[PDB]
């Protein structure tokens, strides 16, 4: 294959230079498990019980007794396959564009296949990271003109039936008000049995700078970050608390456990970018290639993620 196909050899020698995605820091090693599916869905079934009315007193003779009901729930995870196309230079034409310190037509914005593929892969990985965190696919910085996705495709920030807190605009810079909302959200969190687990916090850089300030007359050897870790340690059975900062978020705080039982990520084994065998060829030196990637695979229990939005005027 490598002898017969140059592009396959090129990607194999260059795939090691692509950096690992940043999403891996947001999940524990056990929380991620790959699945073998390009496009389609996977289903799971959960069983619940509930009480219909007060218990019935067993006195004398009685035939009417209160009932315990059951309910079935089927959960479906959707997957989607997406593709991108990029232009490059044919291998045989590279020597006629080689220069002293670079290869490629600067005037016409062309590159050799290897460099073009690496840059393309990096951009797609950025898009994948943005989706996993925010649950949406868009290229505008505003966030509009989103690609219409299939249902049952959600990210951490857009997951429904989760605890959501809003900080008023007038208290945007008041750390006490921000911490007040976080505590209210923390109380409403429902870990239940899965409480003795590590917790994860992701914040925007502006929020992180507010955290490192000393706790408030100011205190000593106590920062707002230290107080927050203690508060989270109260409800997670004094487990490890990790704090990360992501530039993707904007005035948002995300808190969720790192237990596979509550939240699990099941991505496709072909989620990361992969070259396509089809290469467009013509009489000129301009060629085209295709890259495939798969989206979807995030699953979470309801009322287990805290999302705090600091409204900015």
């Amino acid at each position: 294959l490598f002898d017969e196909n140059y592009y396959a050899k090129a990607v194999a020698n260059i795939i090691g230079e692509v950096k690992d995605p940043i999403m891996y820091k947001w999940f524990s090693p056990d929380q991620i498990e790959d699945v073998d599916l390009q496009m389609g869905y996977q289903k799971t079934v959960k069983w619940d019980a509930f009480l219909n009315a007060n218990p019935t007193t067993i006195a004398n003779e009685v035939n009417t007794i209160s009932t315990i009901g059951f309910s079935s729930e089927v959960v479906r995870l959707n997957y989607l396959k997406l593709q991108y196309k990029f232009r490059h230079l044919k291998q045989t034409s590279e020597k006629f564009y080689t220069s002293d310190s670079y290869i490629g037509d600067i005037n016409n914005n062309l590159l050799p296949f290897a460099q073009a593929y690496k840059l393309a892969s990096s951009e797609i990985i950025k898009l994948i990271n943005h989706f996993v965190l925010t649950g949406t696919v868009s290229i505008q910085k505003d966030g509009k003109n989103q690609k219409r996705l299939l249902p049952n495709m959600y990210g951490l920030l857009n997951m429904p039936e989760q605890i959501k807190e809003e900080v008023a605009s007038g208290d945007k810079d008041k750390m006490d008000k921000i911490f007040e909302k976080i505590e209210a959200g923390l109380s409403k969190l429902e870990l239940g049995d899965e409480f003795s687990t590590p917790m994860m916090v992701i914040v925007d850089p502006a929020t992180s700078l507010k955290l490192v300030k000393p706790y408030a007359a100011a205190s000593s050897c106590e920062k707002w970050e230290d107080v927050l870790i203690q508060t989270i340690k109260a409800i997670n059975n004094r487990e490890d608390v990790y704090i990360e900062t992501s530039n993707l978020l904007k005035h948002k705080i995300l808190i969720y456990p790192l237990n596979s039982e509550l939240i699990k990520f099941k991505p496709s084994k072909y989620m990361l970018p992969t070259p396509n065998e089809q290469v467009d060829k013509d009489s000129t030196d301009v060629a085209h290639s295709y890259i495939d990637f798969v989206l979807g695979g995030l699953l979470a229990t309801r009322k287990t993620i805290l999302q705090v939005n600091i409204k900015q005027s």
């Binding site: 005037n107 950025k126 085209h288």
Partner: protein, 153 residues
């Protein structure tokens, strides 16, 4: 001034960290969505018709025909790329549809657009439909994402 690649050099390295809103530049050649079965033709360029509607212009006869920026009833195609060394403009025929950023006359998605005498798109024959609002790159340079579907009254 108006060339695809700015002649003025850049003082500093660019920050390649963000991945949003990094395609609304005048150097973006081609189309946003391109099919492998598209017909594309190069022609000698009269002036700088890049990212403009083109029409066929004839000389006395000593030299072959060329393409110049224009529209109206004389519209022949859309110039999606240009090579300055050879002065060859890549032209997509009007018989082939195209989706990309085009020069807009100095507008909301869904508006009907037709080409003017200078090869610039303007609000209303209908030739293309605006897919976004005007994006300003210079005091007089306005681009817009449009999809052209040939000629229809």
């Amino acid at each position: 001034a108006l060339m695809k690649n700015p002649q003025q050099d850049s003082g500093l390295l660019s920050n390649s960290i963000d991945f949003r809103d990094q395609n609304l530049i005048f150097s973006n050649s081609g189309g946003v969505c391109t099919s492998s079965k598209d017909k594309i033709e190069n022609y000698p360029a009269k002036g700088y018709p890049y990212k403009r509607g083109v029409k066929l212009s004839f000389g006395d006869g000593t030299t072959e025909l060329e393409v110049e920026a224009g529209g109206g009833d004389d519209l022949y195609g859309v110039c999606s790329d240009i090579d300055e060394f050879s002065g060859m403009a890549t032209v997509i025929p009007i018989t082939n549809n195209f989706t990309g950023y085009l020069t807009l006359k100095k507008v909301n998605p869904g508006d009907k657009l037709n080409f003017n005498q200078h090869g610039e798109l303007e609000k209303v024959s209908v030739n293309a439909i605006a897919l976004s609002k005007a994006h300003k790159l210079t005091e007089d340079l306005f681009i817009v994402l449009a999809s052209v579907f040939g000629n229809r009254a």
